[PDB]
Amino acid sequence: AKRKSKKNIRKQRMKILFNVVLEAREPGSGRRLCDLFMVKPSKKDYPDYYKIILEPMDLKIIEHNIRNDKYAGEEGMIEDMKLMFRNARHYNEEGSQVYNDAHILEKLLKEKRKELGPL
Ligand code: NI
Ligand code: NI
Ligand code: NI
């Protein structure tokens, strides 16, 4: 009874938080901030990326995890998002566009979670 309704609220919330990252655009240009986070770089094309980033993460993986109910709650999805953003900021230089995008997308995610409030 009360547990299927609670699983669905959690799953809904996870969709809302995912969609915030997916849809965010740069003011002025309309550039979609999430473009370079959608799929991890090709290992064949950029092997050095995988010597720096030991646990890769991208939105394709997180989308798969959401849809296949692999996360117990949004805190698990958020930890994957945070790993993705940390990877971006570890690999890319400070003041690069991808570095700044990771920062802004992480703030948007955190702000939308506070807006949703406690379960
Ligand atoms: Ni390093
Ligand atoms: Ni799978
Ligand atoms: Ni800032």
Residue numbers in the entry: 478 to 596
Article excerpt on this structure:
BRDs are evolutionarily conserved and present in diverse nuclear proteins comprising HATs (GCN5, PCAF), ATP-dependent chromatin-remodeling complexes (BAZ1B), helicases (SMARCA), methyltransferases (MLL, ASH1L), transcriptional coactivators (TRIM/TIF1, TAFs) transcriptional mediators (TAF1), nuclear-scaffolding proteins (PB1), and the BET family (Muller et al., 2011). The most notable structural difference within the BRD core fold is a hairpin insertion located between helix αZ and the ZA loop that is present in all family VIII members. The proximity to the Kac binding site suggests that this insert may play a role in recruitment of acetylated binding partners. The nuclear body protein SP140 as well as the related protein LOC93349 and PCAF showed nonspecific binding to most peptides. In contrast, the second, fourth, fifth, and sixth BRD of PB1, MLL, and TRIM28 interacted with only a few histone Kac peptides.
Bromodomains (BRDs) are protein interaction modules that specifically recognize ε-N-lysine acetylation motifs, a key event in the reading process of epigenetic marks. The 61 BRDs in the human genome cluster into eight families based on structure/sequence similarity. Despite large sequence variations, all BRD modules share a conserved fold that comprises a left-handed bundle of four α helices (αZ, αA, αB, αC), linked by loop regions of variable length (ZA and BC loops), which line the Kac binding site and determine binding specificity. The four helices form a deep cavity that is extended by the two loop regions (ZA and BC loops), creating a largely hydrophobic Kac binding pocket.
